[PDB]
Amino acid sequence: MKQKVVSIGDINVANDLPFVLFGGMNVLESRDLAMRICEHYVTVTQKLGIPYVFKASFDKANRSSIHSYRGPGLEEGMKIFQELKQTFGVKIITDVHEPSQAQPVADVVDVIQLPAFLARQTDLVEAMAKTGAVINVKKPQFVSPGQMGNIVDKFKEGGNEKVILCDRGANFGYDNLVVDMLGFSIMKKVSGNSPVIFDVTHALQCRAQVAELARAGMAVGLAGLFIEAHPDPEHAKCDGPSALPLAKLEPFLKQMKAIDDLVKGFEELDTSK
Amino acid sequence: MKQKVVSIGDINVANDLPFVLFGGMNVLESRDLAMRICEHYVTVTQKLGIPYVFKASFDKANRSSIHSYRGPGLEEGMKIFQELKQTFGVKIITDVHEPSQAQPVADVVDVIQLPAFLARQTDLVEAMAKTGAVINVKKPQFVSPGQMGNIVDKFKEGGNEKVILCDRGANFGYDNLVVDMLGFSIMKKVSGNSPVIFDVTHALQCRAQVAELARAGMAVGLAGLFIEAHPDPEHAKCDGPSALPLAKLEPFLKQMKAIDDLVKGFEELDTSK
Amino acid sequence: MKQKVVSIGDINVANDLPFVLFGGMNVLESRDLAMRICEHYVTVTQKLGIPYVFKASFDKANRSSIHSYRGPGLEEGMKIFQELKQTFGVKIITDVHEPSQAQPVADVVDVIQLPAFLARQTDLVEAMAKTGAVINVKKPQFVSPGQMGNIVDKFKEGGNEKVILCDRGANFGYDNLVVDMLGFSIMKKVSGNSPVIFDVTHALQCRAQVAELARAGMAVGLAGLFIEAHPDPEHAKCDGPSALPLAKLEPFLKQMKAIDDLVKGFEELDTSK
Amino acid sequence: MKQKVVSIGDINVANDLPFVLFGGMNVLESRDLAMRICEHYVTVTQKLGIPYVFKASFDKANRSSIHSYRGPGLEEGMKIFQELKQTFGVKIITDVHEPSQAQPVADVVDVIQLPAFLARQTDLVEAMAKTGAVINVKKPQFVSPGQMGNIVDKFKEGGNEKVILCDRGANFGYDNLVVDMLGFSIMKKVSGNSPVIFDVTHALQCRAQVAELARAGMAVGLAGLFIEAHPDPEHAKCDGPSALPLAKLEPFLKQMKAIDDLVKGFEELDTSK
């Protein structure tokens, strides 16, 4: 039962391989903050031997008001990914909402993300399947692990088979997320052993709890980990979804590699019988 | 505490008024089936004294595969609403996905629907607020009743205050919906007493159970009821979301008016103290 | 599909019959308050043509601290049921925890209640099946409607078939209950059409919301309704589980009979096909 | 923030200490199977350097029918714990239902367990607080982590402060459990840093999934792990709650110690700021 590998450049993402980091920041506030954030990742990733794909959003469609911070935009934003790639030479992942945005970005970046709310948007899977780029499918909180067969299948059809699944937790009554550790196996199984990644930040909201959560995730064994940081977490340890104090990256990423390695090399165990 | 009224033509939708029906069919399969479906509504509505707004979808973005039945389309579909309005003289409600579709439809139809998955899509609320049309906001299964303040507020901002809220149940573990009867009061309260409607069909999936559910809903007291029917329910009593056997409309709508009336005229009761 | 009837004296409890009230108070604080509470029920029940079974607890095992108000006790409590029966001539229902309490009470009272937490306690079902009394099984928040087959079956075995099921809601994430209106049909079906009753008070906790909830329940159509009141609801409209302001009984019970009747006589509808 | 330690003989149970195993079997089927089961534990525990407390139930009150296998019984069962202690010299933990059973067992055994369904039974906490024995409180699926303050407090009152908390998952819609990894921190915090243990077997039901689950649990860092095994898992890898194939103990317990150690020694990390 050998794992499907998804390769973002030299980067080999798979559930049996050493874990990839899709770290970064929520939005592209400024380049000035983008570059400083990307700095700490690349330095600490490269030091600690952790494959790295940078992540920031150029657009927002989940603002609370209309006359809020949309963000850079499709046009202004892609230049800031040009200027980061050359300066640091890392792979960039960003979310895409409108179908028309799909091709523009697949050129600029390496991994495109399918936001959870739009996971069941065939108009967007169609148009994002076209690009031929590596897809990150965020697993909707309101969709069960087994239902992720259909979204991978829809991608297959559109031609694109370079797909990652990202668990960002599941609705647990009102205004609460829980992470179903069992979900990861089910998403692997139903996905032709596609790479599963745990979006630990977006699986929190209602902390010190980033740590304990992401360990548990990694101890299952995953292809990668999706995290967001901030130098001063919007002030509160949580910029909307719970952002990690940038400073604490290394001693945290220490803990994750330590588990990912201890776990990834394990006399394959079958409690089945 | 007098209710906010939303008027679709002569039709006055409000939580204290006699209940409006937003009945119809899932997709516009053919006009031949559209018109026959619309027939039974108009005849039974008009007989039974139930304000009526017809509902069918022109587009689908919730297909399971890409090379599936998209449906009529934005262009072919709107003609079939022209040809229904003149022939039957009823108000048409349809869902809208892409932001560009918003203005085209607000002309053709009376009520536009904001699909649950895209409820947190500011690009679409913005563009749908513009039209100035009556909005039906489907309440996401993964969003709590109190959170519906923000979506009504976002609509206010964009200029549009002619907004209905539609409960289509809430995620209850994996692959299961429950309807929180308490939700209706909370959505009223937080919405400036906006009209709340119960999408009974879309709150089912995993029946004979359409009946018992929609009673319970109506006994709370609601502005309206959102239902879909079929002559032969795709064969199974459930065309995706659980469709009502068209024949059983009258003896069912009998039951709903009977509750809506008994309830709507009630020495206002305060169990608060 | 004629309903199983359960007869508490002259009182005929069944899902097709006019609805029975199992109204009352949480604990037997004093007789002085017991009798005053029982007064308002009997007067308003008898006025309004609503079969009535009084309910109060003699014991508590759900106190928050040990050195709290246990309540009257097995010995002191049963005398206060003697003194209520003679004075008012109504049927008394009380909960039972220890297996040894089962026989003592089945003599003193008419209906014994199986508390939710102990629903899966064979030692207690065995001993409560023995009595031959009418059982009220509270449906655990953590047990699904279909699982109520097994508890009715366990009762059958022990000899006792005079069993009512009481829905008191279901766990909905942390520290939250939801009532699944669909549950009532499933509990009927799996229970040999046993009488289902809705414990509206105990299905609330986290109100004005008693009203809207109990309507919805009744509009499904039920054998009965389980409620608790207080003259001054411990001060807050909610003595632990949300207690109804005693004064508002009539104008509330007005609303319930009005639905129970409108519903109970209904050209039986099959949305199944 | 040093951890509260609970000492079962020489055995020191605490969230910072190396993890204790509360392994064993569901019921005492026969001594012949009891002793063979206990054999494999003691051999593999002792080999692998894992503190061990054996667990089996003498009684069952969660049978599906009345005329089912009650089990050994309070009298016949305690002799089989005598005969295991002497032969193997390990600490025995068993569940207790009736209040009268509490003192008898606290003599025979080292750790008594408070079953989840009876966690809110003051009559049993009172009587189990008396014994002065080490308590294992199973955390009800229908009770949230923060609510575990009250049960520890109730134990304090009755005199007994030698209390362990055991997470056995939480209700996740109908007939489904999820384990909230975040729960462990909250139960620690609210419990005066009491020892938290993860009942991995009882957190499954609806497997190969025992493995992935218990890793995740341990990677959080816990005082101990509660598991049940069988030579031939009732035939299916799951004797009611999902039992572990006895043979696979070592290569599984290998994995758990490997995480417990890697985790337990960790430059304490604060993602809080």
Side-chain angles (χ1 to χ4, degrees), chain B residues 78-126:
Chain B
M78 292 288 99
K79 299 152 55 201
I80 316 157
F81 286 161
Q82 313 279 13
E83 200 199 294
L84 276 166
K85 271 168 168 282
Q86 59 186 47
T87 318
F88 298 102
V90 267
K91 288 76 156 73
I92 271 72
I93 176 176
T94 217
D95 48 351
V96 189
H97 317 110
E98 314 263 352
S100 50
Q101 293 177 346
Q103 206 49 69
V105 189
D107 301 340
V108 175
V109 318
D110 313 279
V111 200
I112 53 175
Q113 192 173 75
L114 176 55
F117 290 36
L118 319 173
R120 297 253 66 181
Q121 279 288 307
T122 307
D123 289 359
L124 184 57
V125 170
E126 231 268 12

Side-chain angles (χ1 to χ4, degrees), chain C residues 114-134:
Chain C
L114 176 55
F117 290 36
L118 319 173
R120 297 253 66 181
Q121 279 288 307
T122 307
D123 289 359
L124 184 57
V125 170
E126 231 268 12
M128 272 171 66
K130 271 198 70 181
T131 63
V134 176

Side-chain angles (χ1 to χ4, degrees), chain B residues 215 220 248 255 266 270, chain C residues 215 220 248 255 266 270:
Chain B
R215 290 202 227 107
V220 151
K248 288 281 169 62
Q255 282 207 68
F266 256 164
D270 174 317
Chain C
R215 290 202 227 107
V220 151
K248 288 281 169 62
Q255 282 207 68
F266 256 164
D270 174 317

Side-chain angles (χ1 to χ4, degrees), chain A residues 111-172:
Chain A
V111 200
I112 53 175
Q113 192 173 75
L114 176 55
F117 290 36
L118 319 173
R120 297 253 66 181
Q121 279 288 307
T122 307
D123 289 359
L124 184 57
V125 170
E126 231 268 12
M128 272 171 66
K130 271 198 70 181
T131 63
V134 176
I135 315 284
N136 193 222
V137 167
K138 297 294 287 300
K139 169 204 158 289
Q141 50 253 65
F142 59 86
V143 161
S144 87
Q147 296 323 296
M148 297 298 298
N150 289 269
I151 303 159
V152 170
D153 297 340
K154 277 168 83 190
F155 271 101
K156 184 207 175 151
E157 290 192 346
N160 199 321
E161 276 181 63
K162 32 197 90 193
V163 174
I164 307 156
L165 307 167
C166 186
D167 189 52
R168 43 92 74 244
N171 250 264
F172 188 57

